[PDB]
Write a protein that binds this DNA or RNA. Sequence first.
DNA 1: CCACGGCGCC
RNA 2: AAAGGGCGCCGUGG
Length: 538
Amino acid sequence: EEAPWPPPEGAFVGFVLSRKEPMWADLLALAAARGGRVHRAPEPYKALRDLKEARGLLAKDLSVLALREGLGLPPGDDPMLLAYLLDPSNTTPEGVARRYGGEWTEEAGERAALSERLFANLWGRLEGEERLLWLYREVERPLSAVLAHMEATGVRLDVAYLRAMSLEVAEEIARLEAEVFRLAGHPFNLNSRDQLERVLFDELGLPAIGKTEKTGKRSTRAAVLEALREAHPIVEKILQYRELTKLKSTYIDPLPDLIHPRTGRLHTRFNQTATATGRLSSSDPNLQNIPVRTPLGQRIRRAFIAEEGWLLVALDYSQIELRVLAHLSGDENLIRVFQEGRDFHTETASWMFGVPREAVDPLMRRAAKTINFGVLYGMSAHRLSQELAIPYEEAQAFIERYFQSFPKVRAWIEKTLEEGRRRGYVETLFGRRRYVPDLEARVKSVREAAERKAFNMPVQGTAADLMKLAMVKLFPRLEEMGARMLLQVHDELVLEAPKERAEAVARLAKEVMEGVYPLAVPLEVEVGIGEDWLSAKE
DNA sequence: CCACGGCGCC
RNA sequence: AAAGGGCGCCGUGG
Ligand SMILES: Nc1ccn([C@H]2CC[C@@H](COP(=O)(O)OP(=O)(O)OP(=O)(O)O)O2)c(=O)n1
Ligand SMILES: [Cl-]
Ligand SMILES: [Cl-]
Ligand SMILES: [Mg+2]
Ligand SMILES: [Mg+2]
Ligand SMILES: [Mg+2]
């Protein structure tokens, strides 16, 4: 069953890393399988040079390690991508092997054999699924090479700035904690919401605003505290303490340790088979949880900087999910908002707060956004009434008035649920599927939860599909200009270009992103250039 | 790791 | 008056 290295062209690779992060790992073993015959590499790094592509489970990760080693080894077929298209609950090689056959072990030869076996199995299961195969060939497979480039290229950090920030934030946390304990009259677990609830609402007697979801306790969530800002001096201190503590522990302190000593850069890991709707995920750091608006969240982006002689170019799709909803629903009022170049959240804020659009400040706009997303995407009158501190019947009436402004959105939700009940799944514009078997559940809460998943997925997943396709379309032209693609998070992409090319790069990227796919509304992209991510994000 | 819950980012 | 989606974190249980 064994055979000498090197393998024939087209064989499936298997590999074992010393740790899960390819930029940080040694390649313990490398092997390839073809016709069930397995070829094991005598010297893994040397053997990488024999391969023309990385074809097999986790191909992107081997490509990342190859790039570190100065080798252009593009990722090719990967059964993980096939499995994820078949059903996005398929997210790990372990889970995929368990579901479809075989076993994910710690031996390279066995992994190579499994890759071959899973490719055949899953490819067969996809026969005739032309829309999923289009996603595979035109989005997922080429995107894997883009993600390999992003992860291996990494991004420069201003480590001196982070070190200073850590000292400054620690000092401020200490001051805040001390002042909180003084205002409270005693020390307590400032990280315990149960203890906070007691201090705020029993001991200091502040009025409670909201109830927690499941247990109906007095909520201490940020929105409640924000509304109690002027009720007691302790409140603003708690809010600040919570945020500083969180960002220090998750970003400010860990980031400098993630700088790779060989590259001098941070190598964020991107995963394209991780979420239920098709959104990309990042880890080490998870970029998702860096706040956009707060001073410290902004200071964190200031720590992400361009290489000397380069600039960062940051591009953000403006309200892409709402534009997708306009497209999918065909709602005329929604389409009109974007055709007329208006801001959805400002327009609706003006409507719901009864003030002119110019009077909609960022605080009001933030409040409106939270209401819009909650209402559009399925919040009940009960929850809305509690959070808005209004009677139930008033919240129920607001919801009806809201959808009366966008009548075809409701029609779209209903049609989507009707077809989903029939088919057992829902789909994005490009045909990415999420299975929703609980649409036929008899238990009311179980069925209704399935419905909310079902009509949310086509919007979020289509937005994600669009970003991924834009990345695929942009990448080769970027490389032609000597530029790099570094980060993707939220609705944003961050590139790095030589200073002399940055303006041309910004123009090209905006164009490619705005024209990625024709919709019933235009796509808008905001673009900025700077030596750091914050300066570029403006 | 799994469950539960509140809370936090988009 | 059963609780928007996605992704996380922590706490509590094991
Ligand atoms: N509470 C929230 C917040 C966000 N989102 C989803 C919907 C839009 C997407 C991106 O968030 P934002 O960029 O903040 O929203 P936006 O519509 O693009 O508004 P803005 O112009 O302020 O960015 O995340 C959501 O479902 N629920
Ligand atoms: Cl650098
Ligand atoms: Cl379901
Ligand atoms: Mg936005
Ligand atoms: Mg949970
Ligand atoms: Mg938040």
